[PDB]
Curated annotation (Swiss-Prot):
A motif (TXY) lies at residues 177-179. Brain, heart, placenta, pancreas and skeletal muscle. Expressed to a lesser extent in lung, liver and kidney. This is Mitogen-activated protein kinase 14. It comes from Homo sapiens. The keyword Nucleus applies.
Amino acid sequence: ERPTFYRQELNKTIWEVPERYQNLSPVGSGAYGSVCAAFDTKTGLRVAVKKLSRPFQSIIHAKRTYRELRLLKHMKHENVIGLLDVFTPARSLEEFNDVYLVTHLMGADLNNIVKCQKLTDDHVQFLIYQILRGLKYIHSADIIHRDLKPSNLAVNEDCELKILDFGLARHTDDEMTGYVATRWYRAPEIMLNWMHYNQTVDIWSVGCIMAELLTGRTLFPGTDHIDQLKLILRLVGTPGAELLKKISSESARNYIQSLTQMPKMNFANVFIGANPLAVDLLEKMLVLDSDKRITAAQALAHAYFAQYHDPDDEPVADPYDQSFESRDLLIDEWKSLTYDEVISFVPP
Ligand SMILES: O=C1NCc2c(-c3ccc(F)cc3F)cc(N3CCNCC3)cc2N1c1c(Cl)cccc1Cl
């Protein structure tokens, strides 16, 4: 009793989808795949349909696709990108080679919103609240986003926020080189591989975002990895003895000690006019030592968010088994595991 599919050429590739999806209009492409906007006649919703390109071309790719689908199926939260539907036009595992993921249509990311709009302290309050609320949910399931940026944050007419880009292929060395927004929001420990990063890498990204919404300027627009580290240490001060020991990369630890020591700056003189409560939260977020960095849960209980905070409406996730991350399998096995996931999908 599987739906009947109809084919059509879109984005140079042939799209085969269930009849419920009508008026497919391409709205972007890339190496990630191909995305289309469409009307879902079953729910009446406006949705975004993503078709993955050669999802099983290599073991690395087969695993990536499995990882993305697992993540997307686990996410059931208001501020996190959920999955509305997932399908393949294949009737058997042998035919299986195309995977389509359906989700809400948000329309724009944080870069758009900020551009043609002036964010008040209440605007910033509300937007960051939602990010934190979604990160509390992500982190409680031991999931790390690793790449929060304004472009991974979707916002709609009602300023409702959703976190995107999970299990997406890591950025190449050529992608994080130079004067690029793909590196300005990263935590230093992972920009320069000082140690094994933990979930607080995300909190650092949030602070960079919050400061940008508050000042309307990139907090650390480095022209390269070094220049960016310098801008970072200028604001939060050079590392202390404690942090240094934690840096595994002895060449890294050796480079830091070469820079002239510098004290943390006064955030009230950096963020002039800003709500003193925002400044306080920024100081507890932009801490060099990730061990002393504020957690998403703790941040939600911070006075700056009093107007929205509600401990009974900030849900955690169910357990997310990612033992598969250390599992060594062949393409066909990753693929077979991806197939089971597609066919066991249960609409929300
Ligand atoms: O509104 C949405 N909805 C979904 C959506 C997905 C997506 C994620 C998971 C999935 F299962 C299927 C998807 F389609 C992926 C991207 N990117 C495209 C590739 N790079 C990352 C964002 C953008 C969007 N946008 C979006 C759009 Cl259509 C325009 C502007 C801003 C946003 Cl946030």
